Amino acid sequence: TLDHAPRITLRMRSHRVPCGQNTRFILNVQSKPTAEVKWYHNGVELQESSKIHYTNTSGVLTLEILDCHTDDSGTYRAVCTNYKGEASDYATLDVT
Ligand SMILES: [Cl-]
Ligand SMILES: [Cl-]
Ligand SMILES: [Cl-]
Ligand SMILES: [Zn+2]
């Protein structure tokens, strides 16, 4: 298997979450070498915190947002990069 640009094979799902609950976005990327992943909320890069966690387990990418409020609604985007190229996916959160 030659090195290749990241390709997203399972895309995030736009969804709703009741105020105060935790939620996750999950996608799957195929990348060789392994992709560097960045996450964004309405265009602004997310950093890990008590509220935000993200992981990459062999290409399964998960963003977890804890204790969701109205301010957490909006567009979440993952960007996956290696020297061969990039892939990106986005979805919406609606906190109800
Ligand atoms: Cl896969
Ligand atoms: Cl990867
Ligand atoms: Cl965006
Ligand atoms: Zn709360």
Residue numbers in the entry: 4 to 99
From the manuscript:
Titin has a molecular weight of more than 3 MDa in its longest isoform and is over 1.5 μm in length, spanning half of a sarcomeric unit from the peripheral Z-disk to the central M-band. Taking titin kinase as the N-terminal boundary of the titin M-band segment, there are another ten Ig domains towards the far C-terminus of titin, referred to as M1 to M10, encoded by at least six exons 358–363, or Mex1 to Mex6, on the respective TTN gene. To achieve this goal, we have solved the crystal structures of five titin M-band domains: M1, M3, M4, M7, and M10. In addition to the ABDE/A’CC’FG β-sheet sandwich core, all M-band domain structures comprise two characteristic tip regions, which we refer to as “N-tip” and “C-tip” due to their proximity to the N-termini and C-termini of the respective domains.
The structure of the M4 domain was determined in two different crystal forms, with one showing a trimeric M4 domain assembly and the other revealing a disulfide-mediated dimeric state. Two other M-band domains each contain a single exposed cysteine: C20 in the M4 domain (E19 in M1) located at the A’B loop at the C-tip, and C42 in the M10 domain (F42 in M1) located at the tip of the CC’ loop near the C-tip. In one of the two crystal structures of the M4 domain, we found evidence for an intermolecular disulfide bridge across a crystallographic two-fold axis. It is mediated by two exposed cysteines, both C20 from two M4 domains at the C-tip coupled with an intermolecular Zn2+-binding site with tetragonal association of D68 (D68 in M1) and H70 (T70 in M1) from the two interacting M4 domains. By contrast, for domain M4, we found an additional higher molecular peak when using size exclusion chromatography, indicating limited dimerization. Interestingly in the presence of Zn2+, which is found in the structure of the disulfide bridge-mediated M4 tandem arrangement, we detected a further increased level of M4 domain oligomerization. In correlation with our size exclusion data, SDS-PAGE analysis under reducing and non-reducing conditions revealed a covalent higher molecular weight species, indicating intermolecular disulfide bridge formation. We show that two M-band domains with exposed cysteines (M3, M4) have limited potential for disulfide bridge-mediated linkage as purified proteins, additionally supported by a structure of a disulfide bridge-mediated M4 domain dimer (M4-SS-M4’).
